[PDB]
Each structure stands twice: as C-alpha cells, then as structure tokens.
A paper describes a structure:
Influenza virus neuraminidase (NA) is an important target for protective antibodies and therapeutic drugs against influenza viruses. NA cleaves off host sialic acids, aiding the release of newly formed virions from infected cells. NA is a mushroom-shaped type II homotetrameric protein. The polypeptide chain of the NA monomeric head folds into six, topologically identical, four-stranded, antiparallel β-sheets which are arranged like the blades of a propeller.
We found that H5N1 A/mute swan/England/053054/2021 NA (mSN1) expressed at ~380 mg/l as a tetramer with minimal aggregation, exhibiting high enzymatic activity and a high melting temperature. To assess whether loop grafting influenced the local or overall structure of the NA, we determined high resolution crystal structures of mSN1, the N1/09 hybrid, and the N1/19 hybrid. Analysis of mSN1, N1/09 hybrid, and N1/19 hybrid structures revealed some variability in active site conformations, with the greatest variability existing between the cavities of two msN1 molecules within the asymmetric unit of the crystal, reflecting different trajectories of the B1L23 (150-loop). The msN1 structure revealed differences among the protomers of the tetramer at the active site entrance. Within the same tetramer, protomers with a relatively narrow cavity (i) combine with protomers showing a wider entrance (ii). This difference is dictated by the trajectory of the B1L23 loop (150-loop; dark blue with yellow side chains). The variation in trajectory between (i) and (ii) is most pronounced at Val149 (red surface). While the scaffold is structurally conserved across the three resolved structures, each possesses unique active site conformations, which are primarily influenced by the L01 and L23 loops surrounding the active site cavity. All NA proteins were immunogenic in mice, generating binding and NAI antibodies to themselves. mSN1 elicited NAI antibody titres against itself that cross-inhibited viral N1/09 NA. mSN1 showed sufficient cross-reactivity to N1/09 to protect mice against virus challenge.
Residue numbers in the entry:
A (entry chain A), B (entry chain A), C (entry chain A), D (entry chain A): 59 to 469
Write the structure that this text describes.
Amino acid sequence: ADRLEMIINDNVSTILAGGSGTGSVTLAGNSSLCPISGWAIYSKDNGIRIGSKGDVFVIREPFISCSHLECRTFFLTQGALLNDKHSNGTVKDRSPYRTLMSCPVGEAPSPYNSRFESVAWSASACHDGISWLTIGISGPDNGAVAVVKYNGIITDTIKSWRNNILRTQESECACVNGSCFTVMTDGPSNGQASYKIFKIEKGKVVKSVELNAPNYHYEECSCYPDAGDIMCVCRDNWHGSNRPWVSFNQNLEYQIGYICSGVFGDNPRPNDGTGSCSPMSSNGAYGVKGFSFKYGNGVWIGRTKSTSSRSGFEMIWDPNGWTETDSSFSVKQDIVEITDWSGYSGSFVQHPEMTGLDCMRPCFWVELIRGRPKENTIWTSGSSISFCGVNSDTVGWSWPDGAELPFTIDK
Amino acid sequence: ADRLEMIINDNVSTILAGGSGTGSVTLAGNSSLCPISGWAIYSKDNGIRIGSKGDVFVIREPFISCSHLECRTFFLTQGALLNDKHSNGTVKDRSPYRTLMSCPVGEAPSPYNSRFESVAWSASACHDGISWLTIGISGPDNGAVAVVKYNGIITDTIKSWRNNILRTQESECACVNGSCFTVMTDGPSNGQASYKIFKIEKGKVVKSVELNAPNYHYEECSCYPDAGDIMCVCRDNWHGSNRPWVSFNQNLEYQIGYICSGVFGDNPRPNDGTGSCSPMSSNGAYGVKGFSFKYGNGVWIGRTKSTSSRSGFEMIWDPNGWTETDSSFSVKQDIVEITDWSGYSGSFVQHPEMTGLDCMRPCFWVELIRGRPKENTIWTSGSSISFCGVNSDTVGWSWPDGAELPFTIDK
Amino acid sequence: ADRLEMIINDNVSTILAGGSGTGSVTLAGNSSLCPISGWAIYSKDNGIRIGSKGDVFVIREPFISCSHLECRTFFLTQGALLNDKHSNGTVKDRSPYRTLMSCPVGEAPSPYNSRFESVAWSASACHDGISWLTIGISGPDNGAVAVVKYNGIITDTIKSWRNNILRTQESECACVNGSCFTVMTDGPSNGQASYKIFKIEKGKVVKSVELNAPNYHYEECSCYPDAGDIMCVCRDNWHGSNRPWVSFNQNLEYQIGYICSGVFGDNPRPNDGTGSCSPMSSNGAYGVKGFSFKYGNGVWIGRTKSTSSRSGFEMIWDPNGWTETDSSFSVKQDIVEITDWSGYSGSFVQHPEMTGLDCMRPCFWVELIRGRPKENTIWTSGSSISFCGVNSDTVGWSWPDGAELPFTIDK
Amino acid sequence: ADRLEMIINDNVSTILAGGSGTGSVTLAGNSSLCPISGWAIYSKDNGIRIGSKGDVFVIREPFISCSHLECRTFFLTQGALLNDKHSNGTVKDRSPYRTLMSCPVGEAPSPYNSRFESVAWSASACHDGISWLTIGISGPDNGAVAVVKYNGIITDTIKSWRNNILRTQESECACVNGSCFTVMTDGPSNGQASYKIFKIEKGKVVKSVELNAPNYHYEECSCYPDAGDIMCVCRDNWHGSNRPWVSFNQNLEYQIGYICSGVFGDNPRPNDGTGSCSPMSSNGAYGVKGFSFKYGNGVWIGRTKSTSSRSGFEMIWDPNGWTETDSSFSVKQDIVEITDWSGYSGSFVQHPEMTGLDCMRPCFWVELIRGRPKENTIWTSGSSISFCGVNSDTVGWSWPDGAELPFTIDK
Ligand SMILES: *[C@@H]1O[C@H](CO)[C@@H](O[C@@H]2O[C@H](CO)[C@@H](O[C@@H]3O[C@H](CO)[C@@H](O)[C@H](O)[C@@H]3O)[C@H](O)[C@H]2NC(C)=O)[C@H](O)[C@H]1NC(C)=O
Ligand SMILES: *[C@@H]1O[C@H](CO)[C@@H](O[C@@H]2O[C@H](CO)[C@@H](O[C@@H]3O[C@H](CO)[C@@H](O)[C@H](O)[C@@H]3O)[C@H](O)[C@H]2NC(C)=O)[C@H](O)[C@H]1NC(C)=O
Ligand SMILES: *[C@@H]1O[C@H](CO)[C@@H](O[C@@H]2O[C@H](CO)[C@@H](O[C@@H]3O[C@H](CO)[C@@H](O)[C@H](O)[C@@H]3O)[C@H](O)[C@H]2NC(C)=O)[C@H](O)[C@H]1NC(C)=O
Ligand SMILES: *[C@@H]1O[C@H](CO)[C@@H](O[C@@H]2O[C@H](CO)[C@@H](O[C@@H]3O[C@H](CO)[C@@H](O)[C@H](O)[C@@H]3O)[C@H](O)[C@H]2NC(C)=O)[C@H](O)[C@H]1NC(C)=O
Ligand SMILES: *[C@@H]1O[C@H](CO)[C@@H](O)[C@H](O)[C@H]1NC(C)=O
Ligand SMILES: *[C@@H]1O[C@H](CO)[C@@H](O)[C@H](O)[C@H]1NC(C)=O
Ligand SMILES: *[C@@H]1O[C@H](CO)[C@@H](O)[C@H](O)[C@H]1NC(C)=O
Ligand SMILES: *[C@@H]1O[C@H](CO)[C@@H](O)[C@H](O)[C@H]1NC(C)=O
Ligand SMILES: *[C@@H]1O[C@H](CO)[C@@H](O)[C@H](O)[C@H]1NC(C)=O
Ligand SMILES: *[C@@H]1O[C@H](CO)[C@@H](O)[C@H](O)[C@H]1NC(C)=O
Ligand SMILES: *[C@@H]1O[C@H](CO)[C@@H](O)[C@H](O)[C@H]1NC(C)=O
Ligand SMILES: *[C@@H]1O[C@H](CO)[C@@H](O)[C@H](O)[C@H]1NC(C)=O
Ligand SMILES: [Ca+2]
Ligand SMILES: [Ca+2]
Ligand SMILES: [Ca+2]
Ligand SMILES: [Ca+2]
Ligand SMILES: [Ca+2]
Ligand SMILES: [Ca+2]
Ligand SMILES: [Ca+2]
Ligand SMILES: [Ca+2]
C-alpha cells in the first residue's frame, strides 16, 4: 500500500507538471547519430512572402530546437515588422531592442504566434527533456551579460570576461543526461579571441573551461550530442575558410581541430582543392554560421554554392572529409540554387525520447536572407527551411525564399 | 497490488500522452456507413470574404480530416496572402513555396491560426486514433518525393517510381485498425499512368501494390473506410466522365471499376444519358476531384451542376447507380447554385470513436474557387463548405463563396 | 481492490475528457436565483473601436453563455470584417454567408480568436456541464433547417414546420439536470405564428410541445433556469409593447403570460402608464430582443431608455411588476445614456458548479448597435457589454460603444 | 484502502483543476527577499515599435504579476489601437471604454493575444497560488465601484466611500497564506485624502482598515510580500518628493512612514541632498508611480534620472537609505538613458513556489511612455521593460522604447 501511495503521488506530480508541458525524464543523449543517405525536407515558413502583407517580424538567425513534445523556431528580432518604417536597418545588430523569441516550426514569425524568450542580441536555446534552457546576451559591447533562464525563470548570468562582445551559438545548445552545454566567445572577430565551453544544469552554470586554442577562432558554434559527448562545428571569422570544431565529454575535457576536407565549408572560401587540418588562410577572413555532422572519418557538410557570396546551399557527404584533405566527395544534394540567396545555417537533433528511434536524428536549418546589403531595401530579414536526415529515398531541388523585392516600405 | 500498479502506470501514460492530444486506442474502422436521408451543413469558412481585409492564405484543396478530438481543414498554400502581390499566380501549382497546413474547421486560413504540416505541392492526411499521419509531396517533376510524418516526425519517404509527377489524394487517407491507406499516381495525366495503393503503420510504409488497371486512370482519390475495407472514388483525367473507383481490404487485395450510373459525376461531362461501367470517353478528358459514397448498388454522387465548368454543386442519391447505367435517380439536394463557382470536393468520415454512433458517418467538403482563370484577377483561391449525412430532415439551398471580385490588388 | 480499479478507471476517463474541456457531471439547475441589489459590470469588448483598424468581424447578437470553465460571447457574422467592402449591408440578415461563432468574453470578435460553431442566420447555444450544445438555423425562408450539434458533432436537425422562417432565441438555451431547453418560432412576425418548446439531451431532441397561445407572439426568447424550471421572457413583434413570457418544467408542461408592469419593457413602446397582463397593443408592433428576471411578484426589467428608438439602457427593479399593472418601481440603475445607441439584450446565468455559490447567478448582456439604418454607413455591427447581479454595492453610469463613425470604408 | 481512495480522489481533483491552470496549494509568502547584487533584464515587448504596423493596443500601466505557472503583463487600454483614429487622446484617463487586460510577458499587447480581465480605469491583480484575483475600478468620479473577481467570477464589490475618485495600485497586489492585500485611495490628489488597506480571501473582502495618516498621501502603491508581512512603497502626489510607505501584517496592523534617503525617489523632485522621514515638500506636488525594496535599513530605489520629467531610469542601492537622510549611495545601475522617455514603474515578486528558491525574488517593471503631452502626437501609449534581481554579475545600459514618432495617424 505504501508502494501504491508512492507511485500515485509521483505519477500525479508528473501529470501536473506535464499539464504545463514540463517533462519528467531527462534526455539520455547517449545514442549515436542515425545512419542516413540523404535529407528529407521538414519545414518552410515562407516568412518574408507572408510578411509582405501579414504582420511578420523582421528576424535573423531562425534556429530550431526541439523538446520531447514539439520543435520550435527561435529567432532574434529588432522588435519591428516587415513593411514598417521601424524595419529600417540603421540599427546595428547589437541593439537594446533585439529579443530572442520562438514560434512553431513552419509558421511565419508573428507577434500573434511568437512567445517571448529573452532580451538578446546573441542567443542560444535547448531542452533537457524537462524544461527549456534559454541564453540571451544583451548589454554594451564592453560588458555584455548573458541571462540564463530555465523554464522561463532567470537562473544564472554570465558576464563578459574580455569586455569585447560576449557572443554565443545562434543555434541550439546540446543536452546530455540532464546537463546542457554551450560555447561562448569573447574578444576580436578579426584576430585571436577567447573561447569557453559551459556545462549548465537546471539553468545553473556548474562548470566552464577556456579552450587553449592558439591560432584557432571559434564563433557561432553548431553543437550536437553524439554517444554522450558533444561535437561543435563552428565559424573561423579570423583566417579560416574551413570550419573549426571542438568536441568534449560531460566533464568538459575537450579536443579541437579543423575539418580537413578540401571541400571547404565556410563562405567566403577558395575553390575546392587541397584542404588542411589547420586554418585555411586563403579567403579565410569573415565567414558564415554553418554546421557539419561527423560520421567516423566522413563528414556531412552543409555549405553555400558560391565561394564569394551567401548564395545557394548544398549538402555534401565526404566519406573521408573529417581527416583527409582531398577535395573529392561521394554525394551532393542540392538544397538552394546558386541563383538564390541563402545565409546562416545550423544543426539540430531529434532525440530518441521524441522520435522513438534507437539513434540520434540529425537535422539542419538554413536561413534565406533578403534585403540589405545586396538588395535595394531599407531592411534585412530571413526566412527558414529545414531538413532531417533519413535512410530512405531523397531528392535535390531548390527551395528559395521567394519574395519579390523591394517592398512597399522601400519606395 | 501488481494489477493496480500496472493499471496506474498504463493509465498515467495514457493521461500524459492525452495531454498533447495523442490518443491511446486505434480507430477500429469496422463499422458500416450510417443510413442517411440527406446532408446537414457542417461548416463554412467565408475565407475569401474575410481575406479581402484579414490576413488569409491564398489556398487550394481545403480538405477536412478528423481525429477523435477535432476536425481540421488541411490545405495547400503558396505562402502568400490574399490582396498581396505575392498572390500573383504566375507560380505554377508545383512550386518550392507550396506547403500543407491546417486550421480548425470553419475558420479562415490565416498565418495566425494555421499549423504547419509539411512542404508539399501534393498532399494527404488522416488520423489513426493515436496521432496524425501527413503525406507531403514536393520536389522536381522527374523525381518528386513524398515525406511521410507521424505525429510531426518524419517516418518515411516515397520517391517517384515513374519520374512523371508523383501525386496523391488531396483529401484524407483512410485508417482501419491502426493501418492507414492511400493512393498515389505517377505518370501522364492525359494517358495511361501507374497507380499504387499504400498501407502505412505509424508513418512507415508496410506494404504497397501497383494496380493492374489497363485503360483506367486514377487521380486525386477520395478514400473512406467501410466495414474494415477501403473504398476510393477518384478522377479519370484521361478519358472518363464517370468516376473511377478502387476498393481494397487491409492486405491491399483490390477491386477496380467505374461508377456505372448515367448520372455522370465528373466535370467536364456529357449530358445525362446511358452510363457505362467502363471509361466514358465523351467529354472525358480533364476532370475535377470528386467523391461518391456506395450503399449496396446505390450511390450518393456529389457533382457540379454544369457539364462544362466548375459551377454549382449538388448531391444525388441514385439507388442503383453503382451498378446500373440508367440516368434516373431518386433524390437531389442542391448545395451550390449553378450561377456560382464550385470546384474540388472530397469525402471525409467521422468514426464511432468520435461520434458515439454505431456506424461510420459520411461527410463531404466542397471547394469554392474564385479568381483565375475565369475571373479577371491575378490570383486564384478557394473557400470551403462542408456537410455531414444525417438520417433526419434536411433542405437544399445555395451556400456560395460570396466574395466581390476583383480585389484591390487586382487594380 | 475491485473498488480501487473501478475508481481509477472512472477518474482516469474523467481526466482524459477534462483534457479537452469536457465535464463529467451535469449542471443540476435546481437552485433559485441569487438575491441581488444591483448589477456589477462584467465585460466590455470595445469591438467596433478596435475594428476601426484591427481585423474584427461585423457581428450581430453577441450573446454570452457559460460552461463550468469559461464564459464565451457567441455571435452571428456575415463573414465580413469592419472597414472592408464586404461589410456592405445589402445582404439581408438571412444569408448563406452567416455563421454562428464564439470568442472569449471581453475580446473583440476576430477571425484570429473566434471558434466556428455552425452555419446560421438564427442561433442558440448553451452548456449542460459536459459539452456545448449549439443550434444553428440556415436555409431558405420556406424550409429553414436548424442543425443541432453536441460537442461539435451534428446530433439532430429540426426543419421548419410552417415554412415561414424558422427562428430561435439569439441567446443561451437553458440546461437543467442534463436536459437543455429552447424555444423556436415559425410563421409571421406581424401576426399569429406557431411557437414550440424543445427538450434536448446530448444534442438529441427528446421532446417538443407546441404552445396553445392564442393572441400571443413569441420571438427571440431569453430563457434561464430557476429551481428546476425554465423561464423565458421574449419579444412580441406583433402587437405587444410589454414582454411575453413562457415558463415550463422538465416535462414541457408550461404556463404563459405577459409582464403586467406599466414599466413597459419592449421597444418601441408607449410612455409608462397602466400596464396589462395581456398584449399591450399601443406601439406594440415591432420590438427588440430583451430579457427580465422574475423574483416572486417582482421583476428586474432591462430596457432601452427611449420609447421609440434603440437608445440607452437601464435596469429597473419593480417589486410587484410581474403581476401588477402600476408604473411605479423601486430602483433604477443606468447602464447606457439615452444619447447613445443600444440594441438587443439578453440574459445568461452562472451556475453553482461554476461560481461556488448556493444559488443561480443572473447576468445580462447588451448589444450596442452602430451603423445602418440610423447612421450614414454601409455596414451595421454591434459591440457588447455585460453585467452580473450582486448583493453588494453597485452604481449606474453609461458604458456606450464609443466608435467614431463613419469609417474609412464609408467614404 | 480507504487512504488510497482518499488520495486518489483528492489528487484527481487537483489534476482536473490543474487542467485549467488552477493551483491546489496557496503561496506561503513567509520567505524573505533574496540577497541580490544587481538586476538582470527579464523582458522587453517593443510594443509601440511593433504597433506602428501591427494591431497593438494603446495602453498604460503595463504591470506584471506572476502565478505558479506564468508571468503576465496586465495593462489598461482605452479599447483603441496604435495608428488608429480612436487612439486620439481627448478621452480622459477615466472613461467607460477603459479595460484591464493581460498578455504574456514580453509580447506586444494585441487583441489577438490579450485576455480580458475587467472593465477598469484603475486596477490591481495578483495570484494566491490557486486562482487570479483581479480588481477593476470603473464608474463615475463621485461613486466609482471596484469589481473584485476571483478566477474570472465576480466575488465582491467595493464602492467609493469619499465620492472622490476611488483608485488603487496599478500594479500587483500581495498574497500571503491564501489572503491577498491591496491599498485603495479615495479623495483629493492635491491634498489630504483617505487611504484604506484591504484583506481579500477567494475574492471576498474579509477585512479593511483605514490608515490614520495625517499629512501623508498614498497613491498607486507598489506592494510586495516579505516574511509574512506586506510592504507598500507608494506615491505622494500632494507634497512629497520622497516616497511614502505602509507596511502591515496579515491582521492589517500597520506602520507608516516616508523613505528617509536624500536620494529622492519621486518625479518631479529636488536635486539630491538632505532627506526627510517626513514628506519632502520641495517639488513634492505631483509624482509618478514607483517602487522600492527594503533590506534592513537599506533600500533599492528605482527612479527616473531627470528631476523634472519622466526621463531615464536607474536602480540605486542605498545601504542606509530607509532610515538615514544622507544622499550617499553604494551602487547605481543604469536602466534607461536620461535622453529617453520612461514613466510608471512597479515591483513584482516571484515566489518560491514558482522559482524553487528558498527566498522571495524581487523584480520590477518600467513603463516607457511615448506620445502626448511631450511629443506631437494625438495619442499616448507605453511599452514595457522588466528586470529581476540576481546575486550574480549584472550590467547597466539603456533599453529605451525605440519608436520613431510621430506615426502615420498623426499626419
Ligand atoms: C533609414 O535610416 C537612416 C539613418 O537614420 C535615414 O537617413 C537619415 O535621414 C535623416 C532624415 O532624413 C537625416 O537627418 C538629416 O540630417 C541633417 C544634419 O545636418 C539635417 O540637415 C536634416 O534636417 C536631417 O535631420 C540623416 O542624416 C540620415 N542619415 C544618414 C546616415 O544619411 C534614412 O532616411 C532612413 N531611410 C528610410 C526611412 O527610408
Ligand atoms: C504577375 O506576374 C507576371 C509574370 O511575372 C507579370 O508579367 C510580367 O511583368 C514583368 C514586369 O512588368 C515583365 O518583365 C518585362 O520583360 C521585358 C523583357 O523584354 C522587359 O522589357 C521589361 O523590363 C520587363 O522586365 C514580364 O515579361 C511579364 N511576364 C509576362 C509573362 O508577360 C505580371 O505583371 C504580374 N502581374 C501583376 C503584378 O499584377
Ligand atoms: C453597397 O451595395 C449596394 C447594392 O449592391 C450598391 O449599390 C449598387 O451599386 C451597383 C454598382 O454601382 C449598381 O449597379 C448598377 O446598375 C445599373 C443597372 O441598370 C447599371 O447601369 C450599372 O452598370 C451598375 O451595375 C446597383 O444598381 C446598386 N444597387 C442599388 C440597390 O442601388 C452600393 O453601391 C454599395 N455601396 C458601397 C460599395 O459603398
Ligand atoms: C482629436 O480630438 C479632438 C477633440 O475632439 C479634435 O478636435 C475637435 O475637432 C472637432 C472637429 O474638427 C471640432 O469640432 C468643431 O467644432 C465647432 C463648434 O463651433 C464647429 O465649427 C465645427 O463644425 C466642428 O464640429 C472640435 O471643436 C475640436 N475640439 C477641440 C477641443 O478643439 C481633434 O481634431 C482630434 N484630432 C485628430 C482626429 O487628429
Ligand atoms: C510513477 O512513479 C513511479 C515511482 O516514482 C516511477 O517509477 C514510475 O516510472 C512513474 N510512472 C510514470 C508513468 O511516470
Ligand atoms: C543510454 O542510457 C539509457 C538510460 O536509460 C540506457 O537504458 C541505454 O541502454 C543507454 N544506451 C546506450 C549506452 O547505448
Ligand atoms: C488503464 O490501464 C489498463 C491496463 O493497461 C487498461 O486495460 C485500461 O483500459 C486503462 N484504462 C483507461 C481508462 O485508459
Ligand atoms: C469492431 O471492432 C471492435 C473492436 O473493439 C469490436 O468490439 C466490435 O464488435 C466490432 N464491430 C463489428 C465487427 O461490427
Ligand atoms: C472517481 O470515480 C468514482 C467511481 O466512478 C466516482 O464516484 C468519483 O466521484 C470519481 N471522482 C472524481 C474526483 O471524479
Ligand atoms: C439540487 O440537486 C443536487 C444534486 O446533487 C442536490 O445535492 C441538492 O440538494 C439539490 N438542491 C436543492 C433541491 O435545493
Ligand atoms: C494527494 O492527496 C493527498 C490527500 O489529500 C494529499 O496529501 C497529497 O499532497 C496529494 N498529492 C498531490 C501530488 O497533489
Ligand atoms: C513557510 O511556511 C511553510 C509552509 O509549508 C513552511 O514549511 C516553512 O518552513 C515556512 N518558512 C519559514 C517560516 O521560514
Ligand atoms: Ca572564415
Ligand atoms: Ca574526400
Ligand atoms: Ca474526366
Ligand atoms: Ca439510376
Ligand atoms: Ca413589440
Ligand atoms: Ca410596480
Ligand atoms: Ca510627489
Ligand atoms: Ca545613504
């Protein structure tokens, strides 16, 4: 009878928490990436097309993160709407008006369907199986502060340790066994900076270590869990046209490197050729947020089709690209035509607790940027597409943004 | 005590799943169609009237499917809104912007009330009593791919086997005993093509068979469950003004034919006369998505009132129309005046697990198309009406779209 | 142990149904009306003011009905929005576009917050403690059909028995002990017609009786439960400036009469004077939907302040007004200034299962009509206010609509 | 077995109530304020920027109150939208159109996301752990009535006892042990008035006491719970540039005073100098709603940066400011630049039942007012920011409103 009273009370508390969407069992995060052959399209929001008339936020960085019940598109907005004068982009990215918000995947980002997450001009978010963790960085450049919320309640803060634009992933953090992990950068974007990895439990930073990474540069990391460890594929904005990466276990014991493949993943970049396991200096300054998925010595690379502009997008399976420097690959899947605009891209995963699979499902999102600087508008925004890897038949195509620019507000 | 612990745990898991709207018992699908005498109006969304000022999607194919808790209108949109320049219809139906989405029955389809389902220029959706199954076909004409989601998670893919526009129902699939069934077509729309029927469990294709149907043509099938089997009434776009049909059991053992009644159900069509159990060649090319309900040798036929254009709509009970070729019928119920536009129509059912009845309730939806090609606008959209069969008093009338064209965007 | 298994299963089913908002215990409806002294304001939606820019339905008859969890404003819309050309009122009230929908009390009626209920140009709705009952009448004047839904599922139909505009309450029906009751009228509005009262259980009409009421006229009845019986105060559109009423028990055994007070409750009406327990012919043709609450021989009367137009609104407690013909009363509470527009008004109740009280709480809603015919617009709409009776301090004031006419669409 | 049946029934009732968001255990309110070092930003809605095109209410007083599940922004609106002619502010604050409504924290206040709370031109709201208590004052100046709702149901009324504008907090009331407490004022705003404190249980006023406070003036009190008592920091609109305060226990046994610090907290105010524990007459007439948090003899003061206009905002920790009159302080945290508009501000708390902490978390909100009287518009509205105190690293900055005035409606 005591056993029954215990089970009843515990299950009742689980039911009461579940009424609010709060889980009861942490995501294990110990399964490996699923074997896949290609990418099946998951979502397209048509945000800018709809925003030509609907009330849609002007957004950037529409990254996706999933709980055990839903997948959401998180994004940063300047608190302005498309086709409104406040969309005039003479506000620089880091502003007091910028906020991290979220809406259901596939829906246009509107004030009528978007939940508020935090005040942020740089952000990260993930779900540990119980509640949502959100990290939002706001403040001055010389003393930015990341506010860390768990289930909407402020649980911690992280202040800049270099006083030079504290900034983080702009995609989902990675959660394993009830601890979530993220990467933050403080310092120059055109030179050596400082990079730290953080272990956070129930929204409280329980550990951090600074990477000893001379001549490396980490920004806007795409991190995913795999077999109980974390892999982050990032952006070298200093002097690398191949992508830097850092992996670590749950105790923040890490390894670092660069993707060796001659199929260079950053943008801008040189033409394909001999790759390097060190920073590739040629056209290596600047970059774009990106991702890659590691399968042994092979790598799935998501990259633009252009070597010079954020145009086009493609998935490339290079079965030796993680460790070897040749420019040969096996499979290419077209995602966006080179004649059309792309932009930031990131990874996200679907855990077994959501899918029912015995493996970690990889997925990715792509931001389709319209407006300034390449188009004659007063604004810059992005719509989103997203794909998940499957071990079944797929096809390549082009799913571009589709909006007709300039808008009414631009004339 | 062990029995109590088992019941508690299982019912608690049912409660936790039900919190997300996820059922626990599959729909049986073994009851027969309810005896009815007429059709009681169920819904009207006034989509285009509202969209004259509100933010409403330009849509097509507003088909309805029901779970055990709700009925939803699924639809395909080009990601544009009424009275916006992106509604300009020089995008052909099969575009990378087209998406399958859903809203509550009776509501205007808006970005503020519509859930995203999939990227699709051809679609199907149903509910097995536990979760929603969605099928969305996107991609190039020579290699289209259907993404199959169960509870929002990609569970399978189906690639074109003829490289000639893989395409499916544009209405609800049919679920019996935990297996859902659909029909897909690959090949020409003006000649012999290939037709396959699929059995899908938890979003995974567990069986498929290709119909041996020489001189038949199947497109845009309206399928419903009845007594543990499936009946599909479809569209012969090749050379049939009567409608083709295919029925099958849960092992995909099938029968095929054409509705024999001289009350021809397709559009365009000849005037009523002697029917055929074979394809009726006269005015048989082209067509419109439609449905019919079989009661023994009799048939409830939903059809346009015009023989040449998608104008008007009417329900006709022909007590021998499934097998006999005479043009006589018993009952006609007016739905839309011939002076007003109609369009696609489809069937949907309400299962005993939703209604509390001991039989399968038949219902149908009708799409009221406005805009191009017959009206001087830049856009084409559709509103919806829906009726359910009852064994009580009914009446005929005309419930047309009601919008005043052209809109502001057209001048 | 068998007792525990039974309790667990039954409570689990109650929990699963409650997840959808479906109750488990019927409203008793056997308590008497609460003793009150005045009316405390409950809601104001400012619908037309907000609709000057927001996307708000052009509506009529915004009646309120409450479940055990919420109170909703039901209304009829022509499927058009304020400040849109489709709001042009050359559509007569009875149209195929008119629909019964509902939104939360106090909110402006928008396509983004309104649930679809039924297709209807005349309507009624109530809640029996388990599910919502909706009655929506649509169709031609000579054969209108009321579709009766329970929990959103069509459960019955009622066809016109006189072929002369079947029409019903335009306010909430009354539910007692699991049976809900309504009144419908078929026949002329300027002469003797037919009046029927209906007893409906789980959406199925289980009984109906036709009133033997020579020289009486019933339209647009406001019905409420009291002590296990039903009282309806209605509108004599034929030849009565006092209001007709009909009361009945759960077996539809009824009594009829007219409110005897010289404080005449209809509009138009003569000046106050000697009342009648028979139809008051003077200025008795035409009318307005209204209500009254009976307390022994006294009556709470809600009426316009003008004797000729739908202007102003006031509550009047006449402690002998139900049976005596004098024009004297005790208390008057101002609701809307006579310089401002009013319109339809109706009663609604809050049951003990919702309030926690030991009595039936009376409340009422008032429709504030703007537009045609008295104002120079192309449209006619109404906003709503609502009050509930309390036995505590209250005050009179004027809470008018507040919109500035004409709107942009009118020029 | 009887114990099991009791536990099952009680937990089932808790589950059924929790399905509607209704709690089962009252907030204790006996913990002390958390030790903090600074303020981490919690929210920013960008209301006016978004309302330049979106459908956003013109609002005032956007105060925040939290339950055990969510935090909401309550606000008063005139039932008009930004950039609509009805936003013309020749309606004085106290109007029959004004309503108290609420939306999720951080979201722009829209008719599509705002719940209706009450009709009110003065308001208060809080949550006792079970249900929401709302107090809305409407009516004429000489007989205003506060309607008191608990869980949306009218539970009490409070009529003006001085017939001179009954008015209350415009921020959250304070709840301890199932009793909630508020302060109301009746009488002049430029002279001695009457001030009452109210104890309310389940929406019923169970006690009230009138303060014997000669030469004091209380308006727009910000009240918070601390260690089982209530502290209110208010506004002296008569003759005080320092803020008045009143504290009391659950039996309404009270103490009164003024904040002694020479860091004057009201606006307008003199320059910092020698403070007073009595009303500071210099520049003491008029004022602004504000707050302060008491920590022993020290005080956290939120105030404007300007001494003359509602411009700028800053948090100041004065470790002896509650009792000592010196103008020295320890810490200042910038919130809004003095070059930018601020306005009303208030406190709100997050209880242990929401946070999981062992202490009472203090937070505050700030209203950023745009429009009349200082800007050349026809309207006046406010957006909101909010911060919570943390014992971790923070930073000062300026998070202003950000809208570009005048709007389209103003030309
Ligand atoms: C988008 O924002 C930019 C930056 O605010 C706008 O350009 C700015 O336009 C303003 C007003 O036209 C210019 O101000 C002018 O400055 C001079 C100072 O001597 C004075 O003569 C004028 O009275 C006026 O205030 C401002 O200089 C200009 N900024 C820059 C960097 O050129 C731009 O117009 C906006 N675009 C839109 C709304 O489409
Ligand atoms: C709806 O879409 C159609 C198709 O895009 C629009 O018609 C197209 O209009 C464009 C721009 O007016 C035409 O482009 C023109 O082409 C010639 C090429 O020699 C050049 O002289 C001009 O500079 C211009 O770019 C385009 O030809 C035309 N397409 C067709 C098939 O006629 C149509 O205007 C749209 N309707 C709207 C927005 O109401
Ligand atoms: C609101 O609706 C009414 C009724 O539809 C509108 O009045 C109608 O306006 C139309 C078009 O202006 C008139 O049609 C005209 O009829 C004659 C037939 O001989 C023909 O000469 C013209 O070509 C034209 O089609 C119609 O007669 C008229 N109806 C009535 C009863 O007068 C009214 O304009 C609408 N108001 C708005 C949109 O503000
Ligand atoms: C915002 O509201 C104010 C107050 O209602 C508006 O000012 C008012 O404008 C009206 C109409 O223009 C004026 O009425 C005029 O009054 C005289 C009476 O002799 C008459 O000659 C005219 O026929 C007219 O009706 C009214 O006096 C004026 N009120 C005040 C206090 O000056 C104001 O225009 C509104 N602003 C907007 C809509 O931008
Ligand atoms: C119910 O509670 C017991 C004891 O805490 C736990 O082991 C079990 O997993 C819970 N069951 C569910 C379905 O949550
Ligand atoms: C992952 O952890 C879970 C914890 O429940 C365990 O059941 C499972 O076997 C583990 N899988 C591995 C180690 O592959
Ligand atoms: C509870 O669980 C038992 C055992 O699995 C099952 O037979 C029963 O139907 C469940 N009851 C409900 C109401 O779901
Ligand atoms: C349909 O299947 C259900 C399964 O629970 C069964 O109870 C019912 O009798 C069946 N009805 C038939 C075969 O008509
Ligand atoms: C649980 O079920 C029992 C048996 O059916 C019933 O008497 C009881 O009222 C139910 N309890 C609740 C809280 O619904
Ligand atoms: C009303 O009916 C309920 C049914 O539960 C009963 O408990 C109550 O005493 C009745 N009240 C009366 C007759 O006043
Ligand atoms: C369940 O009910 C018991 C008895 O009323 C109560 O003590 C206990 O706290 C409840 N448990 C929960 C989790 O609400
Ligand atoms: C506050 O009251 C709660 C009531 O459950 C009690 O457990 C706790 O110890 C109290 N805390 C104090 C007095 O600090
Ligand atoms: Ca680079
Ligand atoms: Ca290679
Ligand atoms: Ca055909
Ligand atoms: Ca026949
Ligand atoms: Ca009359
Ligand atoms: Ca009297
Ligand atoms: Ca002052
Ligand atoms: Ca000091």
